[PDB]
Design a protein around this nucleic acid. Structure first.
Lengths: 254, 129, 123
RNA sequence: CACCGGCUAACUCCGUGCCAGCAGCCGCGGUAAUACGGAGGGUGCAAGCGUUAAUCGGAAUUACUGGGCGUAAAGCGCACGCAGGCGGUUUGUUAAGUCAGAUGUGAAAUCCCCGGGCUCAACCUGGGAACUGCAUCUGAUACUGGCAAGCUUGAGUCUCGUAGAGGGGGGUAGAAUUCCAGGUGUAGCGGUGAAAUGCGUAGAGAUCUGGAGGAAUACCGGUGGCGAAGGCGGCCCCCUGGACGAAGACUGACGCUCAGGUGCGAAAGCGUGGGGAGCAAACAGGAUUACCCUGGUAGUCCACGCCGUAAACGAUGUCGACUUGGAGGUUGUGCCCUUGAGGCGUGGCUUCCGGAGCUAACGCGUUAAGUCGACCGCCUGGGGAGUACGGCCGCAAGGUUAAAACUCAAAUGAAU
């Protein structure tokens, strides 16, 4: 089937400037493709570690004119392997970026948030519908599970908007660039992250009713009153910190 | 419901002329009879007749010259939603004098020229061209 | 529509909006140049048009156009502006009067001199 | 002094080459430019000529004179109804509106007409007309209003019937899916383009017998019917609203429309409590290069409250009157002879063609988008925007009322 690469030159100047790749940082840009996003990397990085799932691209990618011998190429799926392995190889957290099919762009950051320190900052370009939810806050309609989980790990900052007519066979949606960089310290640490996911999933699965029965499958009114959580407000009104409060309580108690 | 019978009479005349009818009928009243008499004297209709005792009905006979209706355009001026009165030296003229205007003065129903002759004003009922 | 409806609520005229608000119903105004630069026109036109940013005595601050070929404007020049917009230059609605205050007339003009502040060739 | 591409009176040469520049709008300028800069010639005004600002006109573009709302902007989702606007026909009375005459006033100047004075003109000045208005007296009585008495054709009441998925409540029946328990029986079933997750030797799937429970009513069924609209479908009973027809009797204008107000209002969604067979947002898995397959929660169901929105559409407000025809459907009734689906009539609702007329066209066409009257709602270039701020309403989601700055020279409808 057909993918839709970025052609307009005016747009891809902000992206390059925003990343500002210097010398001495590990860049792991997945899916070079036609190198449309690495060719404007001509300030170069004396090296880069590239990952490509296709051997045909890897084969007809080892020479180019000038590329040749600066980068090491891996031919395994990024979703499968251990990024942190290539963390003591250099000795610093890796700086990465990509333009992946929005379709596969969701599972990677949740496969990358686990490895933590081996990662310092990220700059991906995602859909506008999704970017707004990531930087969203309580009491809106863009507030959801994705916002809570992502905000628990790192900081989300939009970087650049791409109007639809920048790509060849341009789609019906708008794309965007956000900057995320993991927190140095957790404002609200949770013993078991999976329990936090369990609570948020259950609460937002009945997003439109009060938590007295939306979340009453596990809790009770007087318990939630104990922690100072109003039992008559919808799941979209609960702040991230509060969502970490019962995350701690459900492990502290039974 | 029915809130203006004079306009109803005028519409009956107009629609009958447009459809080449020979005569029209309608429920009668004094005002309608006076208007019919003024129309007949100016040669716009042939004749009018009233018959009936408890429910009189007025019957008008229309008039054509040669494959043409003689009543070119008949129009109601002062209606229940807006009434029009004119002083003696403001009475209008229709087709610059070729037509008539029906005026109701203190001495009866007449044409604009007759009212001007008698030096009266009144309420304008209709324009007939 | 109906007479009764009009009696309850009359016809209302739309209000006209002026095209030159910074003039405030004055034929001209005096201002001080803050920046002198060059800008490009909109599509199907190609040039390097000369404009300036001016601060007026009434506190407004606008962009104005400098017609003719050649000028001597810099920072802290005192000029006089008038109305009139430039079509293929979005955001420009005023012209600069050549030959008044610190703006000089165009050199070597011979036709339509009075629109550019050129004295009659003593020749 | 301005101008000479069109609007708009007046044309050629040289220079430059999407530069320099011009421009009120449409636009001109990349090598012969009547559009940029100079020159020759010409056009219009003239002691002035151009530019800028501001008001009216053109603009019927807020339409009283004088516009619109099926598809271009524009009929509230639907009904009831207070204030308000309007109101059939006859007689009498009154004289408020209305009309006629007169009197008082409406400063002078100014505007208009006929004259007079500066050598003319501008300017100055005599007399008149006008100042459309208001008040007070005296009359007129056709029309509207008030008051009194009538009338029956508008509107209602009574008597007998007809058709109908109109509404609320309670019973009950037969097919099918799932589950349970029994029989016969041995190894696959299901699904896909092909497979896999999945079910099965603790006997599945298949075929027969018994039960449990929930949701919906095949055929009839129609382009058919009922309802203000949303909508309404097995059978039986109880309570109940409207429409229509026949003959006769009765009341006597008791009417139409309706801003604020009150009520009803698909689906999704919410609160308290039940129920849960099938399906199925979210979710959990399996694949292929979207869409697919296997499980499955909220929900769909019931009682009682909330929400108040839809391409809630005939994109067509309610009431009344008038204007040539032809094919169908459904539901009453009068008269003759009578095997009557036999002939002659007379009502209600509904579908499709098409005449005059209307319309930009498409099209509408007695169920009007034709010819008229009464009242109400709404519109004013496109985007920003049905958005922001404020008020009211809501448990929440949100509903309702509702701008401006800025930006463009178009956006749009029907037909070829």
């Amino acid at each position: 089937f057909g993918q839709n690469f970025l052609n307009d030159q005016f747009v891809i100047d902000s992206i390059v400037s925003a990343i500002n790749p210097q010398k001495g940082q590990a860049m792991v840009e997945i899916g070079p493709g036609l190198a449309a996003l690495t060719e404007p990397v001509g300030e170069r990085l004396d090296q880069l570690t590239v990952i490509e799932l296709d051997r045909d691209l890897a084969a007809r990618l080892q020479t180019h004119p000038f590329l040749g011998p600066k980068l090491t190429i891996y031919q395994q799926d990024a979703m499968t392997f251990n990024f942190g392995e290539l963390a003591e190889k250099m000795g610093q957290p890796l700086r990465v970026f990509g333009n992946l099919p929005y379709n596969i762009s969701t599972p990677l950051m949740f496969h990358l948030f686990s490895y933590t320190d081996a990662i310092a900052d990220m700059h991906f370009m995602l859909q506008k519908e999704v970017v707004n939810r990531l930087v969203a806050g309580p009491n809106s309609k863009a507030y959801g599970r994705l916002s809570v989980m992502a905000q628990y790990y790192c900081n989300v900052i939009p970087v650049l908007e791409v109007p639809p007519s920048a790509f060849t066979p341009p789609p019906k949606v708008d794309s965007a660039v956000v900057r995320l960089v993991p927190h140095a310290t957790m404002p609200h640490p949770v013993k078991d992250v999976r329990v936090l996911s369990r609570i948020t999933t259950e609460a937002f699965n009945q997003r439109r009713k009060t938590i007295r029965n939306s979340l009453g499958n596990l809790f009770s009114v007087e318990v939630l009153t104990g922690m100072g959580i109003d039992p008559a407000m919808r799941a979209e009104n609960i702040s991230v910190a509060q969502y970490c409060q019962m995350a701690n309580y459900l492990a502290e108690n039974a | 419901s029915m809130q203006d019978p004079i306009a109803d009479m005028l519409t009956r005349i107009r629609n009958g002329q447009a459809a080449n009818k020979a005569a029209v009928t309608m429920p009668s009243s004094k005002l309608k009879v006076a208007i019919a008499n003024v129309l007949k004297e100016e040669g716009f209709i042939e004749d009018f007749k009233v018959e009936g005792d408890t429910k009189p009905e007025l019957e008008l006979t229309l008039k054509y010259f040669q494959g043409k209706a003689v009543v070119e355009s008949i129009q109601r001026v002062s209606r229940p939603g807006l009434r029009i009165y004119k002083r003696k030296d403001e009475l209008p003229k229709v087709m610059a004098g070729l037509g008539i205007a029906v005026v109701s003065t203190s001495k009866g129903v007449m044409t604009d020229r007759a009212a001007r002759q008698a030096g009266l004003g009144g309420e304008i009922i209709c324009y007939v061209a | 529509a109906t007479v009764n409806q009009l009696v309850r609520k009359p016809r209302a005229r739309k209000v006209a909006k002026s095209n030159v608000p910074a003039l405030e119903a004055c034929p001209q105004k005096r201002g001080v140049c803050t920046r002198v630069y060059t800008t490009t026109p909109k599509k199907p036109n190609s040039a390097l048009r000369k404009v300036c940013r001016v601060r007026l005595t009434n506190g407004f601050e606008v962009t104005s156009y400098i017609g003719g070929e050649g000028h001597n404007l810099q920072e802290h020049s005192v000029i006089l502006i008038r109305g009139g917009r430039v079509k293929d230059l979005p955001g420009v609605r005023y012209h600069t009067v050549r030959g008044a205050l610190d703006c000089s007339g165009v050199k070597d003009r011979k036709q339509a001199r009075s629109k550019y502040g050129v004295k009659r060739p003593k020749a």
